[PDB]
Ligand binder design. Structure first.
Ligand SMILES: [Gd+3]
Ligand SMILES: [Gd+3]
Ligand SMILES: [Gd+3]
Lengths: 204, 204
């Protein structure tokens, strides 16, 4: 069983919350002890160095919420824009982690420019999917995925020698998907939005 | 040797002291959470250890994104559901930070219930606002604010311990708004979603 992952995540989150909001020196202290126990459990049951765990799992200030992933949904002539990335050799919509300081649409703009060379605007909110519901894997965190539609208003598509790396793909010729970044049904949903742009915008 | 046993004992031992001693309702709610979980972990078989999940942190870098706030938009008879927390005697839609382990709609449901006693369903994605763009509050915290409409289907009007008053207000009679949790303009746009259910979703 790996139910423990969720329990430990909950414990740390509540300890993190306590440390942010408690104003009582003795309870703040209790929360801190509680945070350290959670690091120790995590460190032991993943076989990961304590300080590494503290960094990656318990170094955040303020209340703990899921993290934000942005995916940009760009159509040219009925085909959807994908990028293949280093690790997988598998294809994903342009996007990534949402940066502090940047609005959801700004992250979408930056990631499209960076990953594809295209310049985008006229943004549409299309869906928010829960990562843990749609592409589950044992994970220390929890991820919300915002899909934002964009129109190409400029720039130009990246070029790549000997490797295909940025293409548009049609509904019946989808490439090998990076499931962690987008599931098949998530992609399908964007085509359903394509064929009927006024439909229910999905939220998990 | 099975190390999870004594870690869970400490968690309960500490959370037990926490809820015996603390006179802060928020801290109390946190320690009761921690007591529940430890109990839920205790009830498992005490001779079995947890599956080790190595490389749980192999993929992750500790990357930080903006936090997530969820606001529920609930209309009864053309009036919008507001909640008054004590601190400042000010009014906000049911909502709050999203928690690890919950989908966005699960958050909205959970906070409506806790704060008001109502059961909601029939979720509809309305808007994602960037917090820094609408209600700059001197803290450093970057927050994405998801507005999710939904409908009462059951429950009971129940005033909790964190909440002084639960009331619905029409567009021309808005209470003194907690600007931090919701601006007057965001409230206005929510009313425009009611008038026109095909209004374009706002996204910063
Ligand atoms: Gd990327
Ligand atoms: Gd509460
Ligand atoms: Gd609240």
């Amino acid at each position: 069983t790996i139910k423990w992952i969720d329990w430990v995540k909950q414990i740390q989150s509540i300890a993190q919350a306590g440390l942010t909001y408690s104003k009582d020196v003795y309870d703040i202290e209790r929360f801190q002890q509680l945070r350290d126990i959670s690091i120790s459990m995590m460190s032991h049951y993943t076989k990961t160095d304590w300080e590494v765990v503290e960094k990656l799992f318990a170094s955040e200030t303020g209340y703990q919420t899921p993290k934000v992933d942005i995916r940009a949904v760009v159509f040219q002539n009925e085909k959807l824009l994908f990028v293949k990335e280093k690790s997988d050799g598998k294809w994903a919509l342009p996007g990534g982690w949402a940066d502090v300081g940047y609005t959801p649409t700004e992250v979408a703009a930056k990631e499209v420019f960076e990953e594809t060379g295209y310049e985008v605007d006229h943004f549409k909110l299309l869906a928010i999917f829960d990562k843990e519901k749609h592409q589950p894997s044992p994970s220390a965190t929890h991820v919300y995925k915002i899909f934002i539609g964009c129109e190409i208003i400029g720039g130009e598509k990246k070029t790549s020698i000997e490797t295909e790396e940025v293409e548009f793909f049609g509904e019946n010729e989808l490439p090998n998907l990076s499931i962690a970044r987008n599931t098949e049904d998530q992609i399908k949903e964007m085509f359903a939005y394509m064929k009927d742009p006024q439909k229910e915008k999905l939220i998990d």
